Ligand binder design. Structure first.
Ligand SMILES: Nc1ncnc2c1ncn2[C@@H]1O[C@H](COP(=O)(O)OP(=O)(O)OP(=O)(O)O)[C@@H](O)[C@H]1O
Ligand SMILES: Nc1ncnc2c1ncn2[C@@H]1O[C@H](COP(=O)(O)OP(=O)(O)OP(=O)(O)O)[C@@H](O)[C@H]1O
Ligand SMILES: [Mg+2]
Ligand SMILES: [Mg+2]
Lengths: 564, 563
């Protein structure tokens, strides 16, 4: 055992070499007309792929030092974790460009702290500008276009997402399931979806699937906060002996009643999902009642006499059966913030009847607060869940398409939340052609003016040059700005056209916001008209990740590899 | 086969290892420290900013140079996972002083006078820092020391501050691992006396330096366990039960101090032998209180239950040996101040007992009895703070656990007479107030009271007097010249000229506590902006650095088993 330590410029240069390797291999696949990359498998078959994520997940350099940069970019972009969303391919290129431009300056006797400050400020200001340059999603064609673009121009899966959003609402919970066929079929099933998820993520340290999937679970819906573990202990023991999945929907969960026995034992012999009731006030009662009618769980609450702290005294109410007090559901899917449950085929009529009653109450009350509360309740009760059965020609193609669908759906969700901006890298070019660099310059100048003259003391002038601080801050800003034409230029270059000249045309022609070059038809058109649009969150995340990684590498001053 | 190396070569290689540790740790000094990349063979690289976490992984392939690294990893308790606050600064000061001293020793100089000067400078500086401390009075002071000693973590700092405000000026705090990511804070009724681990040998298995047992069975007595055959049935019963056992006796005779043997040789029986809390008759009363907090049948000859011959006539005990003991929720045995979390069942009994004691407080005039009874009631009541620490990973839990332990220990040392301006200005004060002349005067007097006392040429032929004095003051100068490294390194890591910051602080106007805040790039008052450190941390930093430097200077040989 022995470590090898390396500091300063050498460390930054090796990390930069790894980053540049990842970018040099990924930028070739940017755009729909990206080039192909051949990967030889020792299993005996070579694969020619054009997807940047698949190629990036296999890049690894023999140089243990340079490989650090590769691993760093594989983890910062969530590529190694198999959760890398859309835009990571562009993030690699932008990150490498910004990091190289910054490191070349830092290694030349410059100060990295002011450059990092300028990079971070430029990132924040550019994110605000991109937010101010976004447009909301209104028509269905917008959803179809964003889904197809975020799906590497896959019309089939794009249409699937579009139809999943049309037959459902703009808050539809879509579940991705594996299929045995070669086509991606779409189904719909009635269910309930609220706005609560997995409170303590440690519940996933057994199964590492980022979600919870339990089939035919028994529900225990209450209204109080489960504090005394000896209050629900008999039900817990019963389900621990039968080994059946259990879901508990309480209001809160005392500190010690969720760690001493729930999380540590589920990794032993018990299936429990502790979700909290979704509420903003007393409305919790109504939502819990709806959940108890959807699954027939016998609403537990002190208001209805059934107190969760003494269920042994009233043992002659629920017919002495601790299980007749519980409910049932087909499938339970608990995400980070949106629990979903598929209603059983038996209660279908009951809930339907309840829905009718609620409708009868909707046209019988005024003041707009009861009508809005009832409207939200009816919309939640009569909701649904879209099931996308994804398939492929191989076992690995299924997982690839699964990741593709996950990234596309996440992009569509971020697009229904925040707006959308024209694709093709024109959004990055707008901040360059509209002179936003002068705005960030003015911002750094004001931030330094409120600190230099304001502090009436020359104590800060000798510990550092003021003009040098301004020059370095604006230097970092210039570095972040000058590395925005790489996306569109690389996309056009991979298609076989002069990328730099395309950028020059887009920057010199003052057309509306969104004027770009379509590589599928090699023609200069309007992006928002032909449907080439991206979600604002994707672009914002791309620039934020690139700037954060660049600043982190600039701040890094030491490397340790266990080999000497 | 061994490889032996002496003198300057050995010292130079040890210094190279020490310098490696310092060069890798000083980059994280201060809140604006730089990042360090550590590659794990698992496949994931980690960007860390904590000096302790990075120092625990530095290891050189050079078996000889690696010795210095290991030396500093053990002297600062880093390898033992007991490194408190200030170790990051201790590394830098130790390396600077050690290099300055070795460079002088290697030039045919004498290391003994330099070592003497270093030790004297350390003692004098410690006394000066003690005289430069201020008492802690307001709660904001506790919050500030906790936040600063916690690597500027407002959450954990506030947790410690609230644990000390909502509790007494002792705050028995227990640190436990949690499954959540939000470090929660709880309070639980309990009993805390002034006894600890009478024999640290019980820690040769667990490297946690403390004892934490959940749902233990208590056996509280009043006599001295002299015959092991008096508790042998209970030990045999517990040999079958994999349940924790705690025995609170009065003296625990020499040979009955074998339970620790069965507990370590095979962990078959788990026994914690704590001693009586008081020195005298009050121990009986305290033991009775302990027997009321836990359902323990107080053993003593005055109440008839004698621990010797429990099979005598005219007794009640049915030889059962089991219901005679008590129970508790959790038992925490530290080096001192043992803690027991009261059970949710005996609570009312204790309340009643407390009330009875109060009835005796307003019924007696003897002030000594009212004081003893008041302390007893205060001990019965009270609470214990439980800090459930968590993280985003399994290793982050232990990392935050060590962080919380170091921060709480710093606050404990600060509640005593300890409070000093942060930012390394305390090290700069001994430089700005010409204290070097004070240490010079001390060595001059210590040598004058010895030079004119012999009145013969016996000491002048065995060594130059002026050279000896010059070397002693040389060691003192070495210790003094290495005090601006803390503030300079912090300012340098922040992106500003560190040396110029030190010159400004020393060449400032007439102020005392005036420093440079790197978080808001401004020269302000440390005591005003809450940037304060515990005097014990600074004292330990200087003492450890000087001790390690002197030890390295005295070393004259190295042996590595290789070639
Ligand atoms: N038909 C098109 N014409 C012009 N530009 C396009 C077209 N389709 C997509 N783009 C642009 O190409 C970019 C997407 O490139 P690509 O899909 O190769 O990688 P990515 O989306 O950045 O990351 P990932 O590979 O993970 O999806 C988008 O920013 C979009 O603006
Ligand atoms: N905001 C601040 N501005 C200037 N100096 C500070 C500030 N906060 C803390 N310091 C100084 O930095 C020192 C603490 O540095 P740091 O926390 O990096 O390592 P450490 O506390 O010496 O050891 P460890 O890393 O084990 O905690 C303290 O002595 C304190 O005086
Ligand atoms: Mg794509
Ligand atoms: Mg600290």
């Amino acid at each position: 055992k022995g470590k090898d330590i390396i500091y300063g410029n050498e460390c930054r240069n090796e990390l930069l070499k790894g980053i540049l390797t990842v970018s040099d291999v990924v930028k070739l696949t940017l755009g729909p007309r990206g080039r192909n990359v051949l990967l030889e498998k020792e299993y005996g078959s070579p694969l020619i792929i054009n997807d940047g994520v698949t190629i990036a997940k296999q890049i690894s350099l023999k140089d243990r030092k340079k490989n650090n940069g590769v691993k760093l970019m594989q983890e910062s972009t969530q590529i190694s974790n198999d959760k890398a969303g859309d835009g990571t391919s562009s993030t690699a290129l932008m990150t490498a460009t910004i990091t190289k431009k910054g490191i070349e300056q830092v290694n030349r006797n410059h100060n990295p702290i002011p450059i990092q400050r300028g990079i971070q400020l430029a990132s924040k200001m550019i994110i605000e500008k991109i937010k101010s340059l976004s447009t909301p999603i209104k028509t269905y064609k917008d959803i179809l276009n964003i889904a197809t673009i975020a799906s590497n121009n896959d019309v089939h899966m794009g249409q699937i997402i579009a139809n999943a959003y049309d037959k459902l609402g703009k808050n539809a919970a879509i579940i991705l399931d594996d299929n045995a066929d070669i086509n991606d079929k779409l189904e719909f099933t009635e269910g309930y979806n609220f706005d609560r998820g997995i409170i303590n993520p440690y519940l996933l340290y057994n199964e590492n699937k980022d979600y919870i999937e339990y089939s035919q679970v028994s529900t225990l819906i209450t209204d109080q906060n489960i504090d005394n573990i000896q209050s629900i202990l008999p039900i817990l023991e019963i389900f621990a002996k039968n080994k059946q999945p259990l879901c508990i929907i309480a209001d809160d969960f005392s500190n010690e009643v969720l760690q001493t026995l729930i999380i540590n034992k589920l990794k032993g012999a018990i299936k429990v999902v502790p979700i909290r009731a979704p509420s903003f006030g007393d409305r919790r009662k109504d939502y819990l009642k709806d959940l108890c009618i959807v699954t027939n769980s016998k609403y537990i609450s002190a208001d209805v006499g059934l107190d969760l702290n003494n269920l042994h005294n009233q043992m002659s109410s629920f017919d002495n059966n601790y299980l007749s007090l519980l409910g049932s559901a087909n499938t339970l899917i608990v995400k980070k913030d949106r629990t979903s449950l598929i209603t059983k085929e038996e209660y279908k009529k009951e809930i339907d009847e309840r829905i009718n009653v609620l409708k009868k109450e909707y046209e019988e009350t005024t003041s707009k607060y009861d009508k809005e509360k009832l409207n939200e309740r009816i919309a939640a009760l009569s909701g649904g869940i879209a099931k996308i059965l994804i398939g492929g020609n191989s076992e690995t193609e299924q997982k690839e398409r699964k990741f593709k669908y996950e990234a596309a759906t996440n992009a569509v969700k971020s697009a229904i939340d925040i707006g959308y901006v024209p694709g093709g890298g024109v959004t990055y070019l707008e901040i360059i052609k509209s002179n936003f660099i002068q705005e960030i310059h003015k911002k750094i100048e004001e931030d330094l003016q409120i600190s230099s003259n304001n502090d009436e003391k020359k104590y800060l002038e000798l510990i550092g040059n003021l003009e040098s601080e301004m020059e370095l801050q604006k230097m970092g800003a210039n570095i972040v700005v000058s590395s925005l034409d790489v996306i569109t230029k690389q996309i056009a270059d991979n298609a076989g056209v002069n990328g730099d000249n395309v950028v020059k045309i887009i920057l010199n022609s003052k057309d509306k916001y969104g004027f770009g070059y379509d590589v599928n038809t090699n023609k200069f058109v309007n992006m928002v008209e032909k449907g080439i649009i991206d979600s604002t969150n994707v672009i914002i995340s791309v620039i934020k990740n690139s700037c954060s990684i660049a600043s982190m590498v600039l701040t890094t001053e030491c490397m340790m590899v266990d080999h000497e």
